[PDB]
Design a protein around this ligand. Structure first.
Ligand SMILES: [K+]
Ligand SMILES: [K+]
Ligand SMILES: [K+]
Ligand SMILES: [K+]
Ligand SMILES: [K+]
Ligand SMILES: [K+]
Lengths: 106, 103, 103, 103, 103, 106
């Protein structure tokens, strides 16, 4: 069962700065990694699919990259609305699994 | 209309159906098995084509009993389909060469 | 009764026997060799089918001399069997096309 | 001139063209996809031959949609080409055996 | 004596020679290339058979230009050889079915 | 995305001695590694392609070796003209990537 490591668990950044969340898979999973955003009291929301594919309705500020075992979710010019929990999820091998989560702090 | 050409077509249509159903069933059979990779439809379809043509790269393959049984049906349908096309090409050449001799 | 159809069947029955014996012998030959994976009957049978159809995913393959010799027999039996089916389909098309011309 | 022999040649020339174009397009389609290995022309050409003959070692294979679509065209062109050669060899044997009986 | 049966044999003998020479040349071509595994004769011979039948497990494959060129010759010789056997089986069925109708 | 590690970052050697630069790949890449030389204020210059293949116009003093994940670029009998930055680059997987560089010091 594929383990997804998200470290650090909390990330602090200054308004407008560039931020990067990391997700590490216990074994090579191509680019079968997806990112979700969950604001306080909200349900998860798909941000990036297959490591770097854009989703319609998501600010162009968000981008992903990586392949194999290391993945990055990036936000260029962070802002208040980005404060939330960010999760990665893999679909390479059954069963699907989720990372532990990374909190964005401004 | 020439049977060998009709059977060739029927063979192609049938193969396309086997590929789609095989893709569907492979996913249905492999989910639930820890470690399985044949679990999303787009790649499952690539896998089926990969199997039917007998290329078998090894990037994807079934690990469950029913996934393997589905795989066998796909291999056989592909081998039979392409084999039937070859047979039809043989009948066309044989028939035409007969003409080239008069008959 | 039409020979090409009889030989096709005989070919199928024979292939099924080669697959089962190949599965048995592959396990018999590979156990005792450090690192070998073709060592339990259910997957060995999957491997034999995989080899006979010539798909060869690479999830399982023989590492010993006798396992490889068994593998060759399986490859050849499969190639011959499916090749014989194609040949029979050619005879059916050739015969019927002759009729379609009167003969 | 004997059609089966002409179609065989045409088939060979055509296959060689499919291999070269497939090598070109595979690289064009796979670059831009993280993790892709089918990205330099010399190995892409080796990959295409590997696919056309349906050997498929698994040292290289497409990961993108268009790379896979290119792969399918290559598999089919190869299967069809070699299948057409077999068909021509059948027509040669059938024709000559007829002679061996007088006709 | 029936040509199709003679060509089949000639094909078998020739394939066996291609396998042995291919095994020899593959080793000759791959040694000197860092990372190459097709470098001792016994497995090289297994590799050649593996390639000729087009099974291609992926446990061994050439990484050098000349090793790949040797691989192509082996694939083609195998495809042609087995294809020629199928063609001969077609001529046997066609001839005998003619008899079954009198001719 | 393949990571290329070049350590140590600086290498000191005495005139005429043999020197060796190392390049380590995060995953096995066959022999798809290439070496470049960049003198102060100069553009990169190809030295070795595919880990050990010679390039015409490059002193026979330069040689490379390795396969898999570990690669070495060697200079037999270093001399003043060799003072520069040395980079490895991989072409096994997309996108191509560069090592961080190793400075040669005499
Ligand atoms: K095959
Ligand atoms: K294969
Ligand atoms: K294969
Ligand atoms: K394989
Ligand atoms: K493999
Ligand atoms: K075939």
């Amino acid at each position: 069962d594929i383990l997804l490591t998200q470290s650090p668990a909390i990330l602090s950044v200054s308004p407008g700065e560039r931020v990067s969340f990391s997700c590490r898979a216990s074994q090579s999973i191509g680019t079968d990694i997806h990112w979700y955003q969950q604001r306080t009291n909200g349900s998860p929301r798909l941000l990036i699919k297959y490591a770097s594919e854009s989703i319609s309705g998501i600010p162009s500020r968000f981008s992903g990259s990586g392949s194999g075992t290391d993945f990055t979710l990036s936000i260029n010019s962070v802002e208040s609305e980005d404060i939330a929990n960010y999760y990665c999820q893999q679909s390479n091998r059954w069963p699907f699994t989720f990372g532990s989560g990374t909190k964005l702090e401004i | 209309s020439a049977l060998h050409w009709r059977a060739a077509g029927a063979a192609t249509v049938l193969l396309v159906i086997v590929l789609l159903a095989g893709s569907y069933l492979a996913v249905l059979a492999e989910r639930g098995a820890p470690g399985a990779q044949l679990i999303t439809y787009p790649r499952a379809l690539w896998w089926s084509v990969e199997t039917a043509t007998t290329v078998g790269y090894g990037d994807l393959c079934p690990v469950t009993l029913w996934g393997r049984l589905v795989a066998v049906v796909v291999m056989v349908a592909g081998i039979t389909s392409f084999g039937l096309v070859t047979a039809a090409l043989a009948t066309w050449f044989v028939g035409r060469e007969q003409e080239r001799r008069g008959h």
